[PDB]
């Protein structure tokens, strides 16, 4: 899976229940386009997203049950490299 928008950060791979899990979405010299973020898992995780002002987005989700969460990141209907990701969220 290679390449355009990219995503990296701890929240893409692991987290802990009831604490915010975070990762970054780098849109430096992406076109213009639609960025989709979704998270699927054993609970409805609240997503928050702040523009860091430098072409980078800082994204966190708040998982309330432990388990596996799929993080899906698409740019213009296409999967970013590594998307869908899988975060092991422990208790």
């Amino acid at each position: 899976m290679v390449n355009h928008v990219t995503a990296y950060g701890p929240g893409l791979t692991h987290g802990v229940v009831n604490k915010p899990a975070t990762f970054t979405v780098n849109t430096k010299d992406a076109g213009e386009g639609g960025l989709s973020l979704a998270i699927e898992g054993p609970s409805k995780a609240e997503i928050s997203c702040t523009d860091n002002q430098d072409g980078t987005c800082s994204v966190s989700y708040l998982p309330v049950l432990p388990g596996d969460y799929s993080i899906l990141v698409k740019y213009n209907e296409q999967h970013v490299p590594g998307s869908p990701f899988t975060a092991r969220v422990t208790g």
Partner: peptide
């Protein structure tokens, strides 16, 4: 996947210079 209920949270952003 499928044994327990699964939920989705979503966000869509338009990115533009």
């Amino acid at each position: 996947r499928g044994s327990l209920p699964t939920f989705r949270s979503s966000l869509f952003l338009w990115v533009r210079p």
